[PDB]
PDB file of C-alpha atoms and ligand atoms in Angstrom:
ATOM      1  CA  UNK L   1      96.364  25.399 103.218  1.00 58.93           C
ATOM      2  CA  UNK L   2     100.005  24.457 103.855  1.00 59.25           C
ATOM      3  CA  UNK L   3     101.050  28.122 103.759  1.00 59.84           C
ATOM      4  CA  UNK L   4      98.891  28.722 106.846  1.00 60.72           C
ATOM      5  CA  UNK L   5     100.105  25.863 109.036  1.00 58.02           C
ATOM      6  CA  UNK L   6     102.018  26.972 112.104  1.00 60.66           C
ATOM      7  CA  UNK L   7     101.873  29.167 115.177  1.00 57.44           C
ATOM      8  CA  UNK L   8     101.435  32.892 114.624  1.00 56.83           C
ATOM      9  CA  UNK L   9     101.762  35.785 117.056  1.00 55.14           C
ATOM     10  CA  UNK L  10      99.940  39.093 116.763  1.00 54.93           C
ATOM     11  CA  UNK L  11     102.182  42.011 115.829  1.00 57.32           C
ATOM     12  CA  UNK L  12      99.748  44.796 114.930  1.00 57.76           C
ATOM     13  CA  UNK L  13      96.044  45.585 115.019  1.00 56.98           C
ATOM     14  CA  UNK L  14      94.054  48.302 113.266  1.00 54.92           C
ATOM     15  CA  UNK L  15      90.411  49.302 113.897  1.00 56.45           C
ATOM     16  CA  UNK L  16      89.727  46.139 115.891  1.00 55.59           C
ATOM     17  CA  UNK L  17      87.709  47.891 118.591  1.00 56.57           C
ATOM     18  CA  UNK L  18      85.607  49.598 115.918  1.00 56.92           C
ATOM     19  CA  UNK L  19      84.968  46.221 114.299  1.00 58.61           C
ATOM     20  CA  UNK L  20      83.886  44.687 117.619  1.00 55.82           C
ATOM     21  CA  UNK L  21      81.707  47.790 118.251  1.00 56.81           C
ATOM     22  CA  UNK L  22      79.980  47.091 114.895  1.00 58.80           C
ATOM     23  CA  UNK L  23      79.619  43.399 115.699  1.00 59.61           C
ATOM     24  CA  UNK L  24      77.916  44.397 118.947  1.00 59.46           C
ATOM     25  CA  UNK L  25      80.526  43.266 121.461  1.00 60.93           C
ATOM     26  CA  UNK L  26      80.090  44.709 124.964  1.00 60.97           C
ATOM     27  CA  UNK L  27      82.514  47.248 126.443  1.00 61.72           C
ATOM     28  CA  UNK L  28      84.092  44.863 128.974  1.00 60.40           C
ATOM     29  CA  UNK L  29      84.644  42.147 126.393  1.00 59.43           C
ATOM     30  CA  UNK L  30      86.122  44.670 123.960  1.00 59.19           C
ATOM     31  CA  UNK L  31      88.586  45.829 126.613  1.00 60.81           C
ATOM     32  CA  UNK L  32      89.738  42.288 127.419  1.00 61.87           C
ATOM     33  CA  UNK L  33      90.016  41.393 123.725  1.00 64.62           C
ATOM     34  CA  UNK L  34      92.106  44.492 123.123  1.00 62.41           C
ATOM     35  CA  UNK L  35      94.567  43.607 125.864  1.00 59.97           C
ATOM     36  CA  UNK L  36      95.011  40.163 124.528  1.00 62.08           C
ATOM     37  CA  UNK L  37      97.891  39.325 122.193  1.00 63.08           C
ATOM     38  CA  UNK L  38      96.694  35.908 121.054  1.00 60.31           C
ATOM     39  CA  UNK L  39      98.671  33.227 119.304  1.00 60.47           C
ATOM     40  CA  UNK L  40      96.912  31.742 116.214  1.00 60.84           C
ATOM     41  CA  UNK L  41      97.614  28.050 115.626  1.00 59.42           C
ATOM     42  CA  UNK L  42      96.602  26.498 112.312  1.00 57.49           C
ATOM     43  CA  UNK L  43      96.889  22.806 111.536  1.00 57.13           C
ATOM     44  CA  UNK L  44      95.478  20.375 108.973  1.00 56.86           C
ATOM     45  CA  UNK L  45      94.663  16.687 109.462  1.00 56.65           C
ATOM     46  CA  UNK L  46      93.125  15.064 106.406  1.00 56.41           C
ATOM     47  CA  UNK L  47      90.375  17.360 105.131  1.00 52.78           C
ATOM     48  CA  UNK L  48      89.881  18.868 108.583  1.00 52.60           C
ATOM     49  CA  UNK L  49      91.482  22.246 109.212  1.00 53.87           C
ATOM     50  CA  UNK L  50      91.788  23.497 112.781  1.00 54.79           C
ATOM     51  CA  UNK L  51      92.228  27.130 113.735  1.00 55.04           C
ATOM     52  CA  UNK L  52      92.995  27.738 117.381  1.00 54.76           C
ATOM     53  CA  UNK L  53      93.346  31.106 119.091  1.00 55.50           C
ATOM     54  CA  UNK L  54      95.022  31.147 122.485  1.00 56.94           C
ATOM     55  CA  UNK L  55      95.059  33.977 124.994  1.00 57.11           C
ATOM     56  CA  UNK L  56      95.450  34.283 128.757  1.00 55.92           C
ATOM     57  CA  UNK L  57      91.727  34.707 129.197  1.00 57.47           C
ATOM     58  CA  UNK L  58      90.067  32.805 126.336  1.00 55.40           C
ATOM     59  CA  UNK L  59      91.048  30.034 123.944  1.00 55.86           C
ATOM     60  CA  UNK L  60      88.872  29.303 120.931  1.00 55.10           C
ATOM     61  CA  UNK L  61      89.092  26.429 118.508  1.00 53.38           C
ATOM     62  CA  UNK L  62      87.262  25.530 115.340  1.00 55.17           C
ATOM     63  CA  UNK L  63      87.754  22.398 113.233  1.00 52.05           C
ATOM     64  CA  UNK L  64      86.116  22.356 109.832  1.00 51.01           C
ATOM     65  CA  UNK L  65      86.039  21.035 106.311  1.00 56.45           C
ATOM     66  CA  UNK L  66      86.430  23.749 103.676  1.00 53.83           C
ATOM     67  CA  UNK L  67      83.013  24.340 102.135  1.00 54.68           C
ATOM     68  CA  UNK L  68      80.862  22.740 104.845  1.00 52.31           C
ATOM     69  CA  UNK L  69      78.764  25.036 107.037  1.00 50.57           C
ATOM     70  CA  UNK L  70      79.269  24.459 110.751  1.00 49.65           C
ATOM     71  CA  UNK L  71      78.314  25.850 114.159  1.00 52.83           C
ATOM     72  CA  UNK L  72      80.750  28.155 115.914  1.00 57.26           C
ATOM     73  CA  UNK L  73      80.674  29.851 119.326  1.00 57.01           C
ATOM     74  CA  UNK L  74      82.742  33.015 118.985  1.00 56.28           C
ATOM     75  CA  UNK L  75      85.045  34.425 121.669  1.00 58.57           C
ATOM     76  CA  UNK L  76      82.414  37.085 122.441  1.00 60.33           C
ATOM     77  CA  UNK L  77      79.878  34.251 122.750  1.00 60.93           C
ATOM     78  CA  UNK L  78      77.833  34.553 119.584  1.00 61.45           C
ATOM     79  CA  UNK L  79      76.380  31.305 118.229  1.00 60.24           C
ATOM     80  CA  UNK L  80      76.980  31.606 114.500  1.00 59.95           C
ATOM     81  CA  UNK L  81      76.885  29.511 111.344  1.00 61.28           C
ATOM     82  CA  UNK L  82      80.290  29.615 109.673  1.00 64.16           C
ATOM     83  CA  UNK L  83      81.490  28.544 106.239  1.00 61.49           C
ATOM     84  CA  UNK L  84      85.156  28.719 105.253  1.00 60.67           C
ATOM     85  CA  UNK L  85      86.327  28.358 101.655  1.00 60.70           C
ATOM     86  CA  UNK L  86      89.751  28.527  99.985  1.00 63.25           C
ATOM     87  CA  UNK L  87      89.697  31.300  97.390  1.00 63.68           C
ATOM     88  CA  UNK L  88      92.695  32.784  95.615  1.00 67.71           C
ATOM     89  CA  UNK L  89      95.007  31.327  98.223  1.00 66.50           C
ATOM     90  CA  UNK L  90      93.062  32.936 101.068  1.00 67.54           C
ATOM     91  CA  UNK L  91      90.793  31.389 103.682  1.00 68.38           C
ATOM     92  CA  UNK L  92      87.494  33.252 103.455  1.00 70.78           C
ATOM     93  CA  UNK L  93      85.157  32.855 106.419  1.00 67.71           C
ATOM     94  CA  UNK L  94      81.588  34.099 106.579  1.00 64.83           C
ATOM     95  CA  UNK L  95      79.734  34.045 109.903  1.00 63.93           C
ATOM     96  CA  UNK L  96      75.959  34.454 109.923  1.00 68.93           C
ATOM     97  CA  UNK L  97      73.768  35.017 112.976  1.00 66.12           C
ATOM     98  CA  UNK L  98      70.412  36.719 113.578  1.00 65.24           C
ATOM     99  CA  UNK L  99      70.113  38.001 110.020  1.00 63.70           C
ATOM    100  CA  UNK L 100      73.599  39.526 110.164  1.00 59.18           C
ATOM    101  CA  UNK L 101      76.886  38.503 108.591  1.00 58.61           C
ATOM    102  CA  UNK L 102      80.560  39.360 108.814  1.00 55.71           C
ATOM    103  CA  UNK L 103      83.512  38.240 106.719  1.00 59.07           C
ATOM    104  CA  UNK L 104      86.921  37.254 108.086  1.00 62.60           C
ATOM    105  CA  UNK L 105      89.686  36.731 105.535  1.00 64.14           C
ATOM    106  CA  UNK L 106      92.971  35.080 106.459  1.00 66.03           C
ATOM    107  CA  UNK L 107      95.678  35.524 103.875  1.00 66.32           C
ATOM    108  CA  UNK L 108      99.428  35.428 103.470  1.00 63.99           C
ATOM    109  CA  UNK L 109     101.314  38.665 102.842  1.00 60.95           C
ATOM    110  CA  UNK L 110     105.031  38.155 102.441  1.00 56.92           C
ATOM    111  CA  UNK L 111     106.129  36.266 105.542  1.00 57.42           C
ATOM    112  CA  UNK L 112     103.102  37.480 107.520  1.00 61.34           C
ATOM    113  CA  UNK L 113      99.555  36.215 107.954  1.00 60.33           C
ATOM    114  CA  UNK L 114      96.997  39.015 107.675  1.00 61.78           C
ATOM    115  CA  UNK L 115      93.480  38.733 109.037  1.00 61.82           C
ATOM    116  CA  UNK L 116      90.909  41.189 107.752  1.00 60.60           C
ATOM    117  CA  UNK L 117      87.487  41.416 109.373  1.00 59.72           C
ATOM    118  CA  UNK L 118      84.620  43.322 107.802  1.00 60.85           C
ATOM    119  CA  UNK L 119      81.319  44.285 109.405  1.00 63.01           C
ATOM    120  CA  UNK L 120      79.050  46.783 107.616  1.00 61.15           C
ATOM    121  CA  UNK L 121      81.835  48.739 105.925  1.00 60.82           C
ATOM    122  CA  UNK L 122      84.019  48.761 109.049  1.00 57.46           C
ATOM    123  CA  UNK L 123      87.280  46.942 108.343  1.00 57.37           C
ATOM    124  CA  UNK L 124      89.842  45.721 110.883  1.00 56.28           C
ATOM    125  CA  UNK L 125      93.298  44.439 109.951  1.00 56.18           C
ATOM    126  CA  UNK L 126      95.438  42.311 112.239  1.00 51.56           C
ATOM    127  CA  UNK L 127      98.921  41.191 111.234  1.00 46.61           C
ATOM    128  CA  UNK L 128     100.596  38.039 112.553  1.00 47.65           C
ATOM    129  CA  UNK L 129     104.173  36.814 112.199  1.00 47.25           C
ATOM    130  CA  UNK L 130     105.447  33.280 112.853  1.00 44.04           C
ATOM    131  CA  UNK L 131     106.177  32.527 116.484  1.00 44.24           C
TER     132      UNK L 131
ATOM    133  CA  UNK X   1      86.014  80.288 136.947  1.00 44.05           C
ATOM    134  CA  UNK X   2      89.273  82.261 136.748  1.00 46.17           C
ATOM    135  CA  UNK X   3      91.319  79.059 137.041  1.00 45.36           C
ATOM    136  CA  UNK X   4      89.828  77.913 133.722  1.00 47.12           C
ATOM    137  CA  UNK X   5      90.418  81.042 131.647  1.00 46.70           C
ATOM    138  CA  UNK X   6      92.936  80.595 128.861  1.00 50.03           C
ATOM    139  CA  UNK X   7      93.819  78.510 125.834  1.00 49.41           C
ATOM    140  CA  UNK X   8      94.419  74.810 126.398  1.00 46.14           C
ATOM    141  CA  UNK X   9      95.874  72.184 124.079  1.00 44.91           C
ATOM    142  CA  UNK X  10      95.073  68.483 124.205  1.00 46.05           C
ATOM    143  CA  UNK X  11      97.934  66.327 125.464  1.00 47.33           C
ATOM    144  CA  UNK X  12      96.325  62.938 126.105  1.00 46.79           C
ATOM    145  CA  UNK X  13      93.052  61.106 125.573  1.00 45.31           C
ATOM    146  CA  UNK X  14      91.740  57.895 127.116  1.00 46.04           C
ATOM    147  CA  UNK X  15      88.653  55.890 126.057  1.00 43.89           C
ATOM    148  CA  UNK X  16      87.329  58.752 123.936  1.00 47.85           C
ATOM    149  CA  UNK X  17      86.260  56.538 121.040  1.00 46.73           C
ATOM    150  CA  UNK X  18      84.433  54.245 123.463  1.00 49.26           C
ATOM    151  CA  UNK X  19      82.642  57.258 124.927  1.00 47.52           C
ATOM    152  CA  UNK X  20      81.580  58.471 121.471  1.00 45.78           C
ATOM    153  CA  UNK X  21      80.496  54.880 120.632  1.00 47.27           C
ATOM    154  CA  UNK X  22      78.238  54.984 123.734  1.00 43.85           C
ATOM    155  CA  UNK X  23      76.920  58.425 122.823  1.00 45.67           C
ATOM    156  CA  UNK X  24      75.997  57.034 119.409  1.00 47.34           C
ATOM    157  CA  UNK X  25      78.455  58.923 117.217  1.00 45.53           C
ATOM    158  CA  UNK X  26      78.895  57.481 113.714  1.00 44.98           C
ATOM    159  CA  UNK X  27      82.117  55.785 112.594  1.00 45.95           C
ATOM    160  CA  UNK X  28      83.233  58.573 110.235  1.00 45.80           C
ATOM    161  CA  UNK X  29      82.646  61.284 112.813  1.00 50.20           C
ATOM    162  CA  UNK X  30      84.481  59.257 115.457  1.00 50.33           C
ATOM    163  CA  UNK X  31      87.485  58.915 113.151  1.00 51.45           C
ATOM    164  CA  UNK X  32      87.646  62.652 112.429  1.00 52.78           C
ATOM    165  CA  UNK X  33      87.192  63.521 116.111  1.00 57.66           C
ATOM    166  CA  UNK X  34      90.002  61.154 117.025  1.00 59.15           C
ATOM    167  CA  UNK X  35      92.419  62.769 114.594  1.00 57.13           C
ATOM    168  CA  UNK X  36      91.671  66.167 115.911  1.00 54.57           C
ATOM    169  CA  UNK X  37      93.869  67.764 118.568  1.00 58.48           C
ATOM    170  CA  UNK X  38      91.597  70.663 119.487  1.00 55.98           C
ATOM    171  CA  UNK X  39      92.475  73.771 121.418  1.00 56.96           C
ATOM    172  CA  UNK X  40      89.991  74.622 124.238  1.00 57.36           C
ATOM    173  CA  UNK X  41      89.508  78.346 124.840  1.00 55.77           C
ATOM    174  CA  UNK X  42      87.686  79.475 127.974  1.00 54.17           C
ATOM    175  CA  UNK X  43      86.786  83.075 128.711  1.00 54.44           C
ATOM    176  CA  UNK X  44      84.423  84.941 131.034  1.00 51.97           C
ATOM    177  CA  UNK X  45      82.636  88.241 130.380  1.00 51.96           C
ATOM    178  CA  UNK X  46      80.325  89.288 133.192  1.00 51.42           C
ATOM    179  CA  UNK X  47      78.228  86.268 134.158  1.00 49.92           C
ATOM    180  CA  UNK X  48      78.626  84.745 130.701  1.00 49.65           C
ATOM    181  CA  UNK X  49      81.207  81.993 130.338  1.00 48.73           C
ATOM    182  CA  UNK X  50      82.303  80.951 126.858  1.00 49.14           C
ATOM    183  CA  UNK X  51      83.897  77.622 126.033  1.00 51.90           C
ATOM    184  CA  UNK X  52      85.254  77.332 122.522  1.00 46.56           C
ATOM    185  CA  UNK X  53      86.780  74.244 120.931  1.00 45.79           C
ATOM    186  CA  UNK X  54      88.801  74.756 117.772  1.00 50.02           C
ATOM    187  CA  UNK X  55      89.972  72.106 115.340  1.00 49.67           C
ATOM    188  CA  UNK X  56      90.898  71.998 111.660  1.00 52.66           C
ATOM    189  CA  UNK X  57      87.544  70.515 110.770  1.00 53.55           C
ATOM    190  CA  UNK X  58      85.061  71.798 113.368  1.00 55.10           C
ATOM    191  CA  UNK X  59      84.889  74.689 115.811  1.00 56.43           C
ATOM    192  CA  UNK X  60      82.238  74.699 118.518  1.00 55.12           C
ATOM    193  CA  UNK X  61      81.310  77.467 120.896  1.00 54.37           C
ATOM    194  CA  UNK X  62      78.919  77.735 123.795  1.00 54.61           C
ATOM    195  CA  UNK X  63      78.213  80.835 125.889  1.00 55.44           C
ATOM    196  CA  UNK X  64      76.225  80.335 129.059  1.00 55.79           C
ATOM    197  CA  UNK X  65      75.331  81.511 132.519  1.00 53.48           C
ATOM    198  CA  UNK X  66      76.166  78.981 135.232  1.00 53.93           C
ATOM    199  CA  UNK X  67      72.906  77.391 136.348  1.00 54.90           C
ATOM    200  CA  UNK X  68      70.736  78.345 133.364  1.00 61.63           C
ATOM    201  CA  UNK X  69      69.687  75.578 130.972  1.00 57.55           C
ATOM    202  CA  UNK X  70      70.457  76.347 127.339  1.00 57.64           C
ATOM    203  CA  UNK X  71      70.378  74.801 123.865  1.00 56.50           C
ATOM    204  CA  UNK X  72      73.578  73.339 122.468  1.00 59.34           C
ATOM    205  CA  UNK X  73      74.422  71.757 119.105  1.00 56.83           C
ATOM    206  CA  UNK X  74      77.264  69.327 119.758  1.00 53.04           C
ATOM    207  CA  UNK X  75      80.192  68.699 117.407  1.00 57.81           C
ATOM    208  CA  UNK X  76      78.567  65.403 116.364  1.00 57.35           C
ATOM    209  CA  UNK X  77      75.374  67.380 115.691  1.00 56.58           C
ATOM    210  CA  UNK X  78      73.129  66.437 118.584  1.00 57.53           C
ATOM    211  CA  UNK X  79      70.638  69.095 119.689  1.00 60.72           C
ATOM    212  CA  UNK X  80      70.832  68.913 123.468  1.00 61.46           C
ATOM    213  CA  UNK X  81      69.740  70.831 126.549  1.00 59.76           C
ATOM    214  CA  UNK X  82      72.794  71.692 128.631  1.00 60.07           C
ATOM    215  CA  UNK X  83      73.195  73.002 132.166  1.00 61.94           C
ATOM    216  CA  UNK X  84      76.601  73.885 133.601  1.00 63.95           C
ATOM    217  CA  UNK X  85      77.161  74.504 137.310  1.00 61.41           C
ATOM    218  CA  UNK X  86      80.252  75.310 139.394  1.00 60.48           C
ATOM    219  CA  UNK X  87      80.687  72.593 142.013  1.00 59.83           C
ATOM    220  CA  UNK X  88      83.743  72.015 144.172  1.00 63.91           C
ATOM    221  CA  UNK X  89      85.835  74.131 141.844  1.00 62.86           C
ATOM    222  CA  UNK X  90      84.811  72.078 138.811  1.00 63.84           C
ATOM    223  CA  UNK X  91      82.532  72.945 135.908  1.00 63.84           C
ATOM    224  CA  UNK X  92      79.917  70.198 135.759  1.00 61.41           C
ATOM    225  CA  UNK X  93      77.952  69.951 132.521  1.00 62.31           C
ATOM    226  CA  UNK X  94      74.949  67.724 131.944  1.00 64.08           C
ATOM    227  CA  UNK X  95      73.586  67.297 128.415  1.00 60.88           C
ATOM    228  CA  UNK X  96      70.127  65.807 127.936  1.00 60.68           C
ATOM    229  CA  UNK X  97      68.591  64.687 124.646  1.00 57.29           C
ATOM    230  CA  UNK X  98      65.977  62.092 123.664  1.00 57.09           C
ATOM    231  CA  UNK X  99      65.627  60.713 127.181  1.00 57.68           C
ATOM    232  CA  UNK X 100      69.396  60.273 127.498  1.00 56.88           C
ATOM    233  CA  UNK X 101      72.021  62.180 129.447  1.00 60.69           C
ATOM    234  CA  UNK X 102      75.783  62.435 129.696  1.00 60.10           C
ATOM    235  CA  UNK X 103      77.998  64.326 132.120  1.00 59.72           C
ATOM    236  CA  UNK X 104      81.113  66.289 131.167  1.00 56.42           C
ATOM    237  CA  UNK X 105      83.268  67.547 134.031  1.00 56.36           C
ATOM    238  CA  UNK X 106      86.018  70.100 133.490  1.00 56.05           C
ATOM    239  CA  UNK X 107      88.394  70.416 136.397  1.00 58.08           C
ATOM    240  CA  UNK X 108      91.873  71.593 137.262  1.00 59.21           C
ATOM    241  CA  UNK X 109      94.528  69.035 138.178  1.00 57.85           C
ATOM    242  CA  UNK X 110      97.855  70.598 139.028  1.00 59.50           C
ATOM    243  CA  UNK X 111      98.730  72.783 136.052  1.00 59.74           C
ATOM    244  CA  UNK X 112      96.457  70.776 133.737  1.00 63.59           C
ATOM    245  CA  UNK X 113      92.779  70.961 132.844  1.00 63.59           C
ATOM    246  CA  UNK X 114      91.134  67.532 132.856  1.00 60.46           C
ATOM    247  CA  UNK X 115      87.884  66.802 131.064  1.00 65.64           C
ATOM    248  CA  UNK X 116      86.001  63.681 132.065  1.00 65.36           C
ATOM    249  CA  UNK X 117      83.021  62.496 130.038  1.00 67.80           C
ATOM    250  CA  UNK X 118      80.663  59.809 131.277  1.00 65.15           C
ATOM    251  CA  UNK X 119      78.011  57.956 129.295  1.00 67.92           C
ATOM    252  CA  UNK X 120      76.364  54.872 130.835  1.00 71.73           C
ATOM    253  CA  UNK X 121      79.367  53.781 132.894  1.00 76.38           C
ATOM    254  CA  UNK X 122      81.832  54.454 130.066  1.00 75.67           C
ATOM    255  CA  UNK X 123      84.308  57.132 131.136  1.00 76.20           C
ATOM    256  CA  UNK X 124      86.697  59.093 128.910  1.00 74.63           C
ATOM    257  CA  UNK X 125      89.487  61.309 130.240  1.00 77.47           C
ATOM    258  CA  UNK X 126      91.179  64.010 128.196  1.00 78.20           C
ATOM    259  CA  UNK X 127      94.033  66.077 129.604  1.00 76.39           C
ATOM    260  CA  UNK X 128      94.867  69.604 128.444  1.00 76.90           C
ATOM    261  CA  UNK X 129      97.859  71.812 129.215  1.00 75.57           C
ATOM    262  CA  UNK X 130      98.119  75.575 128.658  1.00 74.65           C
ATOM    263  CA  UNK X 131      99.042  76.575 125.133  1.00 73.18           C
TER     264      UNK X 131
HETATM  265  C1  PLM N 201      86.623  37.173 127.730  1.00 76.33           C
HETATM  266  C2  PLM N 201      86.915  37.900 126.425  1.00 76.33           C
HETATM  267  C3  PLM N 201      87.759  37.043 125.490  1.00 76.33           C
HETATM  268  C4  PLM N 201      87.998  37.721 124.141  1.00 76.33           C
HETATM  269  C5  PLM N 201      86.687  38.127 123.491  1.00 76.33           C
HETATM  270  C6  PLM N 201      86.886  38.632 122.071  1.00 76.33           C
HETATM  271  C7  PLM N 201      85.604  39.246 121.538  1.00 76.33           C
HETATM  272  C8  PLM N 201      85.697  39.548 120.056  1.00 76.33           C
HETATM  273  C9  PLM N 201      85.835  38.274 119.238  1.00 76.33           C
HETATM  274  C10 PLM N 201      85.991  38.589 117.767  1.00 76.33           C
HETATM  275  C11 PLM N 201      86.238  37.326 116.962  1.00 76.33           C
HETATM  276  C12 PLM N 201      86.547  37.656 115.519  1.00 76.33           C
HETATM  277  C13 PLM N 201      87.857  38.411 115.396  1.00 76.33           C
HETATM  278  C14 PLM N 201      89.061  37.480 115.336  1.00 76.33           C
HETATM  279  C15 PLM N 201      90.336  38.288 115.116  1.00 76.33           C
HETATM  280  C16 PLM N 201      91.558  37.430 114.831  1.00 76.33           C
HETATM  281  O1  PLM N 201      91.425  36.387 114.155  1.00 76.33           O
HETATM  282  O2  PLM N 201      92.659  37.809 115.271  1.00 76.33           O
HETATM  283  C1  PLM N 202      83.240  66.643 111.639  1.00 76.66           C
HETATM  284  C2  PLM N 202      83.567  66.009 112.984  1.00 76.66           C
HETATM  285  C3  PLM N 202      84.002  67.057 114.000  1.00 76.66           C
HETATM  286  C4  PLM N 202      84.259  66.453 115.381  1.00 76.66           C
HETATM  287  C5  PLM N 202      83.053  65.670 115.871  1.00 76.66           C
HETATM  288  C6  PLM N 202      83.213  65.219 117.313  1.00 76.66           C
HETATM  289  C7  PLM N 202      82.110  64.249 117.696  1.00 76.66           C
HETATM  290  C8  PLM N 202      82.103  63.959 119.183  1.00 76.66           C
HETATM  291  C9  PLM N 202      81.761  65.203 119.987  1.00 76.66           C
HETATM  292  C10 PLM N 202      81.819  64.920 121.472  1.00 76.66           C
HETATM  293  C11 PLM N 202      81.585  66.185 122.278  1.00 76.66           C
HETATM  294  C12 PLM N 202      81.796  65.932 123.754  1.00 76.66           C
HETATM  295  C13 PLM N 202      83.243  65.590 124.053  1.00 76.66           C
HETATM  296  C14 PLM N 202      84.106  66.830 124.243  1.00 76.66           C
HETATM  297  C15 PLM N 202      85.524  66.424 124.635  1.00 76.66           C
HETATM  298  C16 PLM N 202      86.398  67.596 125.053  1.00 76.66           C
HETATM  299  O1  PLM N 202      85.884  68.542 125.688  1.00 76.66           O
HETATM  300  O2  PLM N 202      87.607  67.562 124.759  1.00 76.66           O
END
């Protein structure tokens, strides 16, 4: 995942609040999340990939091996089971919790890193550029 | 309600999608509603006040006597019981349906007409100016 390594800054967001609505995130949390312009930091050490999201009010970090299911506490505090695989040059993440699931794809588009989140038909697209 | 009579055009909206989310409006309907820039038309004939909302995809109209509960079919198709009273120079509407309720206040602010909608703590503010 060499094409993903680096620090990325959010440049645009589309339908993110609707996605969080669908995920079940509370109003207050949605408002904070929407004000935040996080920096995504991706690094690789051996077979362990680390994705870190930093924002003034909440930093999240997940370290994982591609293909191995792991426990993740999301920014909105959901305890989920996540699995991330490398498919077609994109990092495809599936989070499962309480019989529900959502997919988060991180892919390269030109010189940008695009993150697409899908929850029951609702799709959010967030574009990042290198910091 | 002479200060309300006229045709008004939407100039700004705040937290409207969040309000509709709280009300339980579906994703598709929320998207259409958000694209719309309706014209509000208020008129009075005797003791009957008529509030009409016009938009490319949905026109709504309610005629009522201040203080008398009536049936209303909302734009998002809810069948509610509405009561509108004149309090402090503002038109205060309460809609009740399935054990729930929401308040919609229409008031004058300077040369503008402000509509505030409240649903379980979530407040939306839409400002209109004369057309
Ligand atoms: C105290 C609030 C902190 C922020 C809370 C955010 C709540 C929503 C979390 C959604 C996580 C999945 C979306 C990630 C989007 C991205 O990678 O840019
Ligand atoms: C086919 C879709 C048409 C539009 C559907 C709108 C759905 C939400 C209706 C909310 C009604 C109460 C808010 C009124 C706001 C205002 O007076 O400007």
